[PDB]
């Protein structure tokens, strides 16, 4: 499980694209084996940010979704712009 | 022919013998029948304030006489009634007893 | 194509058909045999009068234990009814046939229904 | 149109049951577009939706 297996995709539904705007929260899809330590680590190392907390949930389709909140010194809009999707 | 008259419908004798559950749902049809006989039309619409005065006292509490006011009018586009209809409305009176039938001026 | 037995001239004619309809076979056979042989405008007037209970349809073969009426005298029966669904289907197919005849360029004032037939779907 | 959803959300925002909300009948095509609690909070604010006061149960006879 490298940090390229851990973080699988970003989630781009227009309900999720509002948390990045108001709540300052990046929504990700991670692997069914990662935990709230590895998710924090992988995000921090890939985008050089300050993670405040991570919440997770195993969806009915089968995969696992992460809610990663950032600190008041960063901007999820700009980080998602760098990743490309907005 | 546009025209407007006032009427007193004796509603006691048209409901005599009807089941209690169906007295107020039947004064409705009796009034439509009345208006069709008099104004000779086929489309009859009742103002929703005549519904209130028919149902004022429940299903089995219709009045004995009703003072009405009927108007024959011209119908609008997408009509199949060639081209008239009646609009029935209630009038306000102390009693509904002792009144003949008159013609309203406009 | 391949209609039932129709002895007539196929140049002065028009056709119309409908298959797999959710109607009653027994009721539709009577409202077909009722207008079988009439003129077009007369038949359409008749079917318009039936929908207002001004005239009836003589039930002549599928008629067990239905009730008698006074509108069966015009035809010579006592049993008669008013199948609305069947009358509507038949008076749609009739309008289709009339439009087809107009397309072929036939004279609408001379049109009589010369063949009409119903049978059972699966 | 179909204002079932708007009735439900309006009743949930005001704080009453579905039997105590009044959706104006002349402005149907404005409520047809209100599909968020924010839009409904605007409509209740201006007046297109009202609260329909409570039926009395007096105790004078008691």
């Amino acid at each position: 499980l490298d940090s390229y297996k851990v973080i699988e995709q970003p989630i781009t539904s227009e309900t999720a694209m509002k948390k990045v705007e108001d709540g300052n929260i990046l929504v990700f899809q991670v692997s069914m084996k990662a935990n709230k330590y590895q998710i924090k680590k992988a995000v921090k190392e890939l985008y050089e940010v300050d993670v405040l907390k991570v919440n997770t949930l195993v969806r009915p389709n089968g995969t696992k979704k992460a809610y990663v909140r950032l600190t008041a010194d960063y901007d999820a809009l700009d980080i998602a712009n760098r990743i490309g999707y907005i | 022919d546009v025209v407007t008259r006032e009427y007193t419908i004796n509603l006691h004798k048209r409901l005599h013998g009807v089941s209690f559950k169906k007295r107020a749902p039947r004064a409705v049809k009796e009034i439509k029948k009345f208006a069709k006989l008099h104004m000779g039309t086929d489309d009859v619409r009742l103002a929703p304030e005549l519904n209130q005065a028919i149902w004022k006292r429940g299903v089995k509490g219709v009045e004995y006489r009703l003072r009405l006011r009927i108007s024959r009018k011209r119908n609008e586009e997408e009509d199949a009634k060639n081209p008239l209809f009646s609009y029935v409305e209630p009038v306000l009176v102390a009693s509904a007893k002792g009144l003949q039938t008159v013609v309203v001026e406009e | 194509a391949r209609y039932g037995a129709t002895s007539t001239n196929p140049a002065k004619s028009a056709s119309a058909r409908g298959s797999y309809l959710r109607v009653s076979f027994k009721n539709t056979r009577e409202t077909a045999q009722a207008i079988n042989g009439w003129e077009l405008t007369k038949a359409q007037k008749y079917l318009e009068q039936v929908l207002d209970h001004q005239r009836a349809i003589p039930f002549r073969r599928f008629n067990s234990s239905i009730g008698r009426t006074a509108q069966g005298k015009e035809f010579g029966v006592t049993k008669a009814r008013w199948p609305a669904k069947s009358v509507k289907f038949v008076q749609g197919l009739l309008q289709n046939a009339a439009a087809n005849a107009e397309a072929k360029g036939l004279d609408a004032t001379k049109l009589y229904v010369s063949h009409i037939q119903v049978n059972q779907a699966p | 149109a179909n204002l079932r959803t708007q009735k439900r959300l309006a009743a949930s925002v005001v704080g009453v049951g579905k039997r105590k909300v009044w959706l104006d009948p002349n402005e149907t095509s404005e409520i047809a577009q209100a599909n968020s609690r924010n839009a409904i909070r605007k409509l209740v604010k201006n007046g297109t939706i009202v609260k329909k006061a409570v039926t009395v149960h007096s105790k004078s006879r008691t």
Binding site: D2, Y4, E8, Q9, P10, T12, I83, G84, Y85 | - | - | -
Partner: protein, 59 residues
Amino acid sequence: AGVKAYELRTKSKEQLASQLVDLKKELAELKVQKLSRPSLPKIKTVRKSIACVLTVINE
């Protein structure tokens, strides 16, 4: 469209790994791109490239 085995059969034991991480980064960004693009044929090439490298590494 991809790597060649007789090419890879001489490269050093470190350029191989750096190639692996480059191809995996490429796939990672390609998933985010395909999150909007209709259909992309570079995926079937990059997967088989990763695999053709890992084979020689194992050998």
